[PDB]
């Protein structure tokens, strides 16, 4: 039989993993941009702990 039974979560399925494993990867680099800017904000001044409260 070459009939119907349209695509479900068993067929495409795994791009809902690689989406959800791509956004969680992007949250971790969103923190990594938040930290690397604090070191560039430490070009002039203090140890970058008070900046994490004011800027956030």
Asked if residues 16 and 25 have their Cβ atoms less than 8 Å apart, the reply is: no
**Sequence-separated (6 or more) residues with CB below 8 Å from residue 51:** 38, 41
> How many residues make up the chain in this entry?
56
Pattern 17-56, binding to ligand POV, x per CB under 6 A?
xx-xxxxxx-xxx--xx--x--------------------
Cα separation, 7 vs 39, whole angstroms? 49
Restricted to residues 15-54, the positions that interact with other proteins (CB under 8 A) are: 15-16, 18-19, 22-23, 25-27, 29-30, 32-34, 37, 51
State the minimum distance, in angstroms, from the CB of residue 48 to ligand POV.
15
Among 7, 46, 47, 49, binds other proteins (CB under 8 A): 7
């Amino acid at each position: 039989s070459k009939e119907a039974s349209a695509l479900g979560v068993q067929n495409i399925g795994g791009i809902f993993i690689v989406l959800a494993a791509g956004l969680v990867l992007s949250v971790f680099v969103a923190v990594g941009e938040f930290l690397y800017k604090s070191k560039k904000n430490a070009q002039l001044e203090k140890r970058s702990f008070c900046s994490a409260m004011v800027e956030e």
